[model samples]
Target chain A: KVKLFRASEPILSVLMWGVNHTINELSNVPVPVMLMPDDFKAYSKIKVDNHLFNKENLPSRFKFKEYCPMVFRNLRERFGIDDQDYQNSVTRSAPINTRFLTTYDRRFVIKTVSSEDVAEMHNILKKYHQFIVECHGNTLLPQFLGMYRLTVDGVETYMVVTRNVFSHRLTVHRKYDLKGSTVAREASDKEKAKDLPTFKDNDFLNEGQKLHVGEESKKNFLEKLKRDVEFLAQLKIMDYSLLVGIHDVDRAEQEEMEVEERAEGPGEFDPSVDVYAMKSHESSPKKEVYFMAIIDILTTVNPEQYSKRFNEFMSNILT
Target chain B: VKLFRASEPILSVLMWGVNHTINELSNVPVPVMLMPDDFKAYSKIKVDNHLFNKENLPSRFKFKEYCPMVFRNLRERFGIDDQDYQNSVTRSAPINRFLTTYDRRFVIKTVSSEDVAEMHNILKKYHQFIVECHGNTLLPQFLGMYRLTVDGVETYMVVTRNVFSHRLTVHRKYDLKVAREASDKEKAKDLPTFKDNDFLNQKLHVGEESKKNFLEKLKRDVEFLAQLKIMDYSLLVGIHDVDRAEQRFFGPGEFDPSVDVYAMKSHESSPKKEVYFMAIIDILTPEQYSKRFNEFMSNIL
Candidate 1:
């Protein structure tokens, strides 16, 4: 048995991927869960006659911290233990409640004060899903399961659930650096490693310089890094354009706000920031290595905001 | 001053392709010839309306023949010296009149009976001058210029004119024979009579036999003749097909009846008729030829 917590009615609304939550319940096996009264505020109250929850009514005041306690309480109920007993068990070892991992699976990536503009996000995700299904055939992102609302301590919370693909958030550069290290130090690492083959001394450094001793080699490495950055920047622009075209916006107001937000970010980050980054690293080949990085960034970012930012970024770069 | 009989009714008919004729008449400075009675028909009758000669109307079986007679009398009065002048002239120079050699500028070919029927049927459904013009272009054989009738004579006749190309008809074998004779009999008779430059031949036979001699000298002229006949037959067939397709006729109905008539006459000559006639002949090569002479003859005939 598993449990989930979300904002409750009149404050926040739950909208399934164009389907009803009751319709999903008919197919979903019974899971032991509780709805806290306060968490119900996240979900908008759906009138029986109006089956679809109005997205405009989804509350912006609710935060992730307020809903975490309600989720823990629901987890306690699922384990058939009282809250005090569950708290003691959680201290020594990880809780056995499947909701610990699965809670995040159904969790909403919240946008405080940004709920009214969420239609752009939905449009982007819808287009990305369609593109991945049709063009890429790579199901790297989560599949939209459905959306629902829950009441926790009388507050309603709206949340969208999806089939989560990743156990932990992994950045594009981290994955590349890890893979690069693994490939370079193959022999010695193979011997020490339990799962993968180990790397020898020469394997880590290539033919000329030792892994620890090459200043000139560091310059070569930097040059390679620069090239890769440029290539990935181009790929990001292409993928971003595809998403924007496919996820056509009904209103430009949401996109304009997102672009403005992206422009106001930290130092040296203009609309052409991606292009500047790419131009800084201009020697990479146009291949899978370049494409992989862009795809990684694309999947991690909020698709709606990313699409608007990336389009502006590319228009400056191309010009 | 030239006195020509004028058809009173014909003067009034709307003249197309005769703007120059009208302008020429208007500019004639002298007092031109005019019969007031004739002028009355020209002024009174409408263009394209049927005109009938009451004198030519047969009381027993009055039909369209009287109308045609008026048309015929009008044509003769306008063009010929007398009403019966054309018939006599046609008889004396049958080939010239029939073949459209006389007054070649104004001569028109006769429309075939089949073509007239087809045109009438087509015009019944689509009555437009443009359609009639298209029909005329398609049916080149339908080129009748005159329709005539005499007052006492009940019969009306439609005169047929022929189409002829102005270029000289090429007789290939005869040209070859003549060329061979001129070369071989250069010095035989009357060749050295005058100056060296004035070498002329008075004996026609001497030069003529050169062609016969050239054929005799050949090992097998029969083979050569056979080859030539086939070549000519193929050429004729190709041209015939092209002409047929151009005219938009699917078969040799009214379009090629004359060719068939010629072929039939050729067949009745003798069994060796097929040996002489070939539709296509290759002028450059003596070897290549088609031998389907009889088939072409029978099919067209």
Candidate 2:
């Protein structure tokens, strides 16, 4: 009858508890026919003081505040996510990522953000929600679902929830974070030493890497990217990177077979949830799947100039 | 693999139905208010699985809710949270006919198609009455009514809030309108069903305050029943004596009046300190039977 909110860290458990609690509360609030301007500024805050009760996984005292709940709730609706499913994803099991965590189901990415980032989210949220509606929830931009600030032991942690850019089931063997800039825009030697190094534009260029998604897929992706970047540019947003994660289907199949010696099935994905995923062309040298999305769109930069350059680099990456 | 495992497919289906319906209801925005159309509307879900997702459900089955909006509003009116209700039903299979939830907070009774039709006939008026009465009544608190189809056979069930407390033990219970002579077979059970004649010989002294409050409720409830031309109902009485209480962890005869809606404390000057639960049950059968049953039940008080 009780949600455990079990996790390795108390903050994550707080997140689970907050999401579970807020969504359930949202369930009671009647859905309005249309959004009022006040809905954008609205928030729901709860302070829990557990007195010798349910302390196994959660903190004895914590505070959870959801920013613009009605707005995010509407965003989730546009994003085709059921509130119950979102609640279950976070609370049914513990979420895992350090400062950045993915839900156990790998459906959502929960990033610990700064208070300023929270403010930034509030600033762009109206436009973001409006853009999502205009695009019919079809953009490659981050699908922001819910945002919260959790206070555990009096330390405040802000978090933003988004649909994961990478596929839940697919393993990304190679990945890149491209910002359309070549000057000191590559991964450092320290960054390059990691298991899944986030390579840069120069690294991609040096390796002569191309997505090879064929003309049809390339055209559609560029069209989406163009519209998305133009929207960002209009908002004077810049320095955002196109996070690319490449899944080598043949390599994954070989690796999986090597590990288990049994082949159940491989390299398939549900496009609805894995919104950023695309398959390589049959004529390509390797069977692959690519997950690409715009990320880190919070910082300041030149609007039109960066948008044009970013669009050009991304467009060129495809065959 | 053993989700919603029950002794019968029907029971499992019932659990699945509640879980699914509640989850779906969570997605549906709580309306600003109910309309006339809400009482007439229903939600029906049909599942036809082929070699998948059959661990907890049948390959082919259907679940339907009768007047979903009305019942949801009823649940809210009773101060029962939607998620809590869902957890009570789906958290475990209901106890092995007129089954209580695992927590004993609710009771699910299987009814005939005719009873469901009767419910539909009276639902709008019943809802309005519940609203007018502010959900304070001696009548059964109808939470949800549903129909399930497994194979060609369709089963109808109605859910009601438990008359007795979930925590408190009812040492003795009576079906007061009431019953026929108990057979040797009935006498052999853990808690045998006692008849009206049996209860007449055994009385309860729940002070004048409790007596008046209960009698007033019964009078209003029966008057409503008579107005609806309904009859054949019984007054279900469950007695819990504080002195005879078994669980040391709990205060003897202590109960929350809000939750234990029908519980009444025994009169201090009389026989023993006891908690009595009195409610009208099986409300289905007119003015003649209503007045007679009300008088008989009032006399017992």
Candidate 3:
């Protein structure tokens, strides 16, 4: 199984410069691809002669579409995937709630967002990249590839492309609360067996022995209760330093709270919350995990604005 | 014998601040002394009920008639002796420099711009205090201790204090060529002795040989041939770093290269040139030395 993870919400509109670069870099496909702004999907694939649509003589049809595909259709067509195959790939893919995989042979965790959302994502990532680079440490960060803007179904949309890390680890949602009790019990027994000897050496022999019995039977049930505190702590520290360094480099000020006067009911000022969809999958030798921020479909609240506030909150960890 | 060394020249105007501080801290009976601009010494020896004389303060005295004796009076009242006594104790006795008795003794070194011209008298002994206290390591440096201003005097000054090592060891100048030959010979012998099975086995033998054959015999005869390198590489590094750090902390880009340039040209960079004085009494101690520095004079130079 191939799993794709996105660090943030899908970008709606990549900068014009980025779109131009991507198009030029991927101009060698048989199918003609055009960037349009009206469709959420950024690019459209059209059958055309290579000479007519070459860089020197791009056909007018390519410019007619308002929405453009996230990835250039010509580039995807070069991979020899047909329209039906492409549609099937997207349709067969799981919905982007926490995590999903695409049917396009290569799995992709889909993240949808508006053009405005993409701008905020780019800014946050750029700030982070600059900070980490200056701090003098080798770090593995997702490299931004390209972005495109198109109009899908009369709606303006944008999407960004990045290097995808393929992994086999199941998404958190997939593994959450769903494993059978018997299997869980067995895993728990194994875990306890590994932990008991260490506990016995630490003067917890009595308690260790007590927990050892029926550990296999209670594996699934008891394992769920065990929290990986150390792993979580390490993750938090790394995340905190990354965010802090970003804020420091950017010289961002903290959000201020103003006091409101009212003898009535209590009032609270809460900033917008950002929604993150995390996906995990087993790709090859190692399990890959990715996070996608869903920033599209504005309800009463604007997801793009919320994502901005979320980034601000994350940046506060550094400061 | 006692010896004194100065890190730099001394100016009377700058000594005024030292005079004030000493007086404020004074519990002794002697009057304050100061050096006049004309290089003459004077003192305010009047026995006043109050240690401070608001009306007859040294600052009120005229430049030509100003008595530098106020400095002597203050030193004497504090029971501080000159550097000569300090070096005598250090070189002759086997006492450690850190001993309390040495700490309490009077030791002074003169640092003046005019003294730099007398390289022959500047590098006699190693001023351990300046080496230890000036910065992070054992490097020679001048510390600014006080500022002085005499109302009637034409100029104000900075009274910089430094632990000075006298440049001349035996009250006689040495010929540079002969001194170099002797130094090279001694170095050759010392090199041969290093092959001894054990260092301690011949440590006394090495010292005795160098002392009797090289130092004692040539003590006065090699006066005409004595030659010592003015600045060691370590001292240069220390002085450069000190200059740079101070410039960075205080003046930033305003560091003047002229001061070092002047020191180099005058061959007054380090006082090691007078190691002959250090070899005397077979030892050099921290106490019984006296010297003073005049930063104002140095600045002008």
DockQ scores of the candidates: 0.00, 0.02, 0.00
Of the true interface contacts, each candidate retains a share of 0.00, 0.00, 0.00
Segments in model 3 whose C-alpha atoms lie over 4 Å from true places:
A1-103, A106-108, A131-143, A162-319, B1-301
Candidate 3 global lDDT:
0.25
lDDT of 2 by residue, A35-144 (tens): 87777877766555543323567776787888888889999999999999999988888987628899998999998889888888889888988899999998889989
Write candidate 2's Cα lDDT for B1-301 as tens digits: 2267777889888988887667656645677978777766666655544332345567678788887778988999888899899888977889956898999999999998899988988988998888988888889999999889887699999999998888788888788773465558887887667878776664688767777877888888889988998877888888877787853565777788877777777787767777888898988536888778878888886
Top of the candidates by DockQ: 2
Query: Relative to the unseen true structure, what is the C-alpha lDDT of residue A155 in candidate 3, on a scale of 0 to 100?
Result: 45
Ranking by lDDT: 2, 1, 3
TM-score of 3: 0.18
* Candidate 3 lDDT for residue B157: 23
- Measured against the true chain A, the candidates' chain A TM-scores are 0.26, 0.96, 0.27
Please give the TM-score that candidate 2 achieves against the real structure. Answer: 0.56
B1-301: candidate 1 lDDT, tens digit per residue: 1111122212111111122122211222222322222211210111110111112221112111112222223333233222133322222222321233233312332334453344333322221221333322111122122222223322222332222211212111111111123333544544221221121221111123333432232213223345333133121211112222234424331233222211111223233212111222211123432223323222332
Evaluated on CA atoms against the true complex, candidate 3 attains a DockQ of 0.00
Cα shift from native, residue B282, model 1 (Å):
99
Model 1: per-residue Cα lDDT over A1-319, one tens digit each: 1111123333222222112223221222123254434332222222221111112333322212122223323332332334333222222222111022232221122222223323333334334433433433222232333333443335544444332221212111111111221122334444545443323323323423212213443343343334333333434422322110001122233555688899982112121111112111223222111111122222245434444444333222211
